[PDB]
Amino acid sequence: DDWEIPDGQITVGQRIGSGSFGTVYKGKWHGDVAVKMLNVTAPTPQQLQAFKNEVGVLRKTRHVNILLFMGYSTKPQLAIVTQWCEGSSLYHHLHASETKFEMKKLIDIARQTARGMDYLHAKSIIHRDLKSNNIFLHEDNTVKIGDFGSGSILWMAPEVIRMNPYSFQSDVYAFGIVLYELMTGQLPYSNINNRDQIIEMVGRGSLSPDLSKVRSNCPKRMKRLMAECLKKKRDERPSFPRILAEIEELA
Amino acid sequence: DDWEIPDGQITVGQRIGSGSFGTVYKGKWHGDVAVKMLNVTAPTPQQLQAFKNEVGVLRKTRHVNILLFMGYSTKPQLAIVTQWCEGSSLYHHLHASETKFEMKKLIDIARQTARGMDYLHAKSIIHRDLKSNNIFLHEDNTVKIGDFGLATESGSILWMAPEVIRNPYSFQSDVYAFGIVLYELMTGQLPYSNINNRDQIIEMVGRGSLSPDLSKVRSNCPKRMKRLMAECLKKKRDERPSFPRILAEIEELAREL
Ligand SMILES: CCS(=O)(=O)Nc1ccc(F)c(C(=O)c2c[nH]c3ncc(-c4cccnc4)cc23)c1F
Numbered sequence: 093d094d095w096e097i098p099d100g101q102i103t104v105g106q107r108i109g110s111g112s113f114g115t116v117y118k119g120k121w122h123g124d125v126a127v128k129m130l131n132v133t134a135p136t137p138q139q140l141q142a143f144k145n146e147v148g149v150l151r152k153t154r155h156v157n158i159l160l161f162m163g164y165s166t167k168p169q170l171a172i173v174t175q176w177c178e179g180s181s182l183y184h185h186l187h188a189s190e191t192k193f194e195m196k197k198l199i200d201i202a203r204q205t206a207r208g209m210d211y212l213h214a215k216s217i218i219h220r221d222l223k224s225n226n227i228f229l230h231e232d233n234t235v236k237i238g239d240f241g242s243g244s245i246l247w248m249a250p251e252v253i254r255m256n257p258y259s260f261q262s263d264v265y266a267f268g269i270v271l272y273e274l275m276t277g278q279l280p281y282s283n284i285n286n287r288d289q290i291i292e293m294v295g296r297g298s299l300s301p302d303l304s305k306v307r308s309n310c311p312k313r314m315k316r317l318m319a320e321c322l323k324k325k326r327d328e329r330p331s332f333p334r335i336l337a338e339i340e341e342l343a
Numbered sequence: 344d345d346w347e348i349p350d351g352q353i354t355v356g357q358r359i360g361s362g363s364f365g366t367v368y369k370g371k372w373h374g375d376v377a378v379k380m381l382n383v384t385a386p387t388p389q390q391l392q393a394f395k396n397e398v399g400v401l402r403k404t405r406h407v408n409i410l411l412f413m414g415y416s417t418k419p420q421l422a423i424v425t426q427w428c429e430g431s432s433l434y435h436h437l438h439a440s441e442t443k444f445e446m447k448k449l450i451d452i453a454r455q456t457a458r459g460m461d462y463l464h465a466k467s468i469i470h471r472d473l474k475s476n477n478i479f480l481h482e483d484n485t486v487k488i489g490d491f492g493l494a495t496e497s498g499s500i501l502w503m504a505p506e507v508i509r510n511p512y513s514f515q516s517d518v519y520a521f522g523i524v525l526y527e528l529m530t531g532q533l534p535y536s537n538i539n540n541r542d543q544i545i546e547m548v549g550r551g552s553l554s555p556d557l558s559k560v561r562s563n564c565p566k567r568m569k570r571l572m573a574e575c576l577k578k579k580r581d582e583r584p585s586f587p588r589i590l591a592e593i594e595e596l597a598r599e600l
Pocket residue numbers: 108116117126127128150159160161172173174175176177178179180181228237238239240241
């Protein structure tokens with residue numbers, strides 16, 4: 093039916109962060125929620141529908157590894173309401189906490205991410221921006237993928253960089269970088285700190301992630317799987333169901 | 344929009360529960376999932392309303408403390424696809440595991456349960472079958488409320504309020520059952536131990552001379568929880584609070600101590 097939450101039902105709290113679209117706050121609504129208020133004030137009737145369309149896309153996601161959509165608001169500002177995640181992003185663990193994860197967890201996280209990613213493809217949903225920042229680990233066990241309802245070029249496929257370039261293949265490339273981060277412990281092109289350089293080089297096929305940076309612990313069974321994900325040639329990339337099967341066999 | 348999952352996608356596995364309500368197997372569908380299916384030649388549409396009601400009530404929930412409904416089925420067996428849960432029920436932990444908790448966790452479990460129950464009532468949903476058995480502990484410490492079935496919008500006798508025991512079901516009945524669940528958390532024990540007759544409980548609780556022994560609460564248990572619990576267990580419907588007030592008092596406690 094309708095998942096709108098009437099004005100005054102949510103007690104908006106502390107400002108968590110800002111994104112290109114939206115500002116995230118912690119909220120009070122039958123427990124803890126997260127509210128993403130759109131960068132918008134007025135009830136513009138035509139962008140209203142445009143907003144509602146994105147809600148329609150969100151409300152078709154009922155998977156454990158996808159961040160739980162819970163409702164939307166219209167009156168105290170346009171807003172997306174989801175579950176609250178305890179802990180930090182996958183980016184924070186890998187790069188900002190220096191926290192040592194056992195190799196067993198890494199594969200699980202990838203497996204969880206692939207579970208979420210396959211589901212979106214099954215529902216014919218292209219994420220368009222899958223990175224470790226949009227992967228929230230609830231209580232450091234459970235993957236929640238969000239932010240799918242002049243940017244992050246590290247997870248960007250070659251065909252996306254040079255301009256329909258957004259497809260299920262580009263999400264596959266994004267996952268390879270995610271795997272890279274997990275299996276190398278860091279972001280790609282770390283030595284080359286030049287955005288424009290990377291854009292031009294990865295775009296022309298001159299640059300690709302370095303796999304000598306993977307640790308010895310990494311199974312070469314899916315070290316090969318990255319290569320499949322990280323292919324410059326998009327049609328030579330594995331689909332996510334294909335991907336989901338291979339990763340799972342690792343335990 | 345459609346939540347129908349046509350078959351072939353679903354890879355059924357090992358069953359965990361059975362009966363005449365639908366067997367529940369552990370399937371794999373884009374990961375670990377759960378399926379509750381009728382093993383029948385044909386559910387000649389007497390079952391077809393029960394199934395349709397549950398799909399209607401499930402499709403309208405999206406909460407972390409409510410079991411995650413993932414889909415339904417019509418073509419072969421009737422089935423309900425929900426998230427897979429890792430762990431055992433609250434009933435298992437308190438009673439069937441002989442495990443024990445700190446006050447800290449016990450009050451937390453009540454809160455998460457209160458959140459889901461508050462959510463259900465806000466969506467104008469009556470659970471009608473709330474008990475420790477239907478409260479799953481997923482990831483070993485996060486509440487999942489399920490087994491809707493009797494939901495709408497024998498063996499379950501202990502969580503039954505007099506007006507149901509003596510349409511009886513209401514938000515108030517859910518409230519009474521909540522008080523019983525609180526009792527299991529704050530005592531570790533099921534109500535009416537000194538009564539091993541089904542006929543004793545059913546008459547006495549219905550009559551209004553039987554009530555849980557609140558002397559059995561833990562020493563570490565808050566005086567506010569024991570007070571809150573007695574309010575949910577009121578013999579008279581009207582004197583029972585609503586979950587917004589129930590959740591409010593709990594939240595302070597969890598923060599207070
Ligand atoms: C599926 C809906 S979406 O539109 O595609 N995504 C989405 C919508 C609304 C949101 F608020 C959030 C969000 O940032 C968070 C949603 N729950 C969260 N829980 C924790 C955090 C967080 C992240 C980093 C540091 N501290 C807290 C961030 C979020 C969100 F990701």
